[PDB]
Ligand binder design. Sequence first.
Ligand SMILES: *[C@@H]1O[C@H](CO)[C@@H](O)[C@H](O)[C@H]1NC(C)=O
Lengths: 50, 49, 99
Amino acid sequence: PTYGVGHQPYRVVVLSFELLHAPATVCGPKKSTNLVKNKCVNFNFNGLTG
Amino acid sequence: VIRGNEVSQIAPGQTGNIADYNYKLPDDFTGCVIAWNSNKLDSKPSGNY
Amino acid sequence: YAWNRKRISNCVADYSVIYNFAPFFAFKCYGVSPTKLNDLCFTNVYADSFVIRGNEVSQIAPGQTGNIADYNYKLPDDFTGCVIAWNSNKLDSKPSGNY
Ligand SMILES: *[C@@H]1O[C@H](CO)[C@@H](O)[C@H](O)[C@H]1NC(C)=O
């Protein structure tokens, strides 16, 4: 504890994501909306918008 | 757990001791690196070994 | 105002041992990368050592104005090299005040 501020211990957590190529297993808390077809809509399919 | 001099070594495209011999990140890495001080938990007056 | 300059030449400069000498966070360089200082090599190395306060560490940079950068210590616009700064409370501070 008597060392300098650059010699202090540091706890590191590295969250390594990987982008969606497989079916998504971990996803954030967003409420799903019922599907409608044959209409000009905004879609949000597993994070990708359009 | 590392020291404060090597927190900058946890990054893509870096060399040194941690990034060369202990823990190497890829150049196309995506994600977040979270670090905070732990002097109250990982330090002793006799020395942490 | 009377900063010391030390000329370093004719020796083998290992920059990885600097991290053991002083407890600084970052080896902040401007024209060169801090991790590539062992492969490439130079003609002369100068070390300028002085003491300032924490509001004025950001003034030691190419292209700043203020008090240190305008009157005390000015860096050139085409400056290549590294600036190392660390806290010195336990050795360079007194209860009565440093003069
Ligand atoms: C600085 O030099 C003194 C005297 O040689 C020595 O006792 C001390 O351990 C040195 N400090 C470091 C960090 O090398």
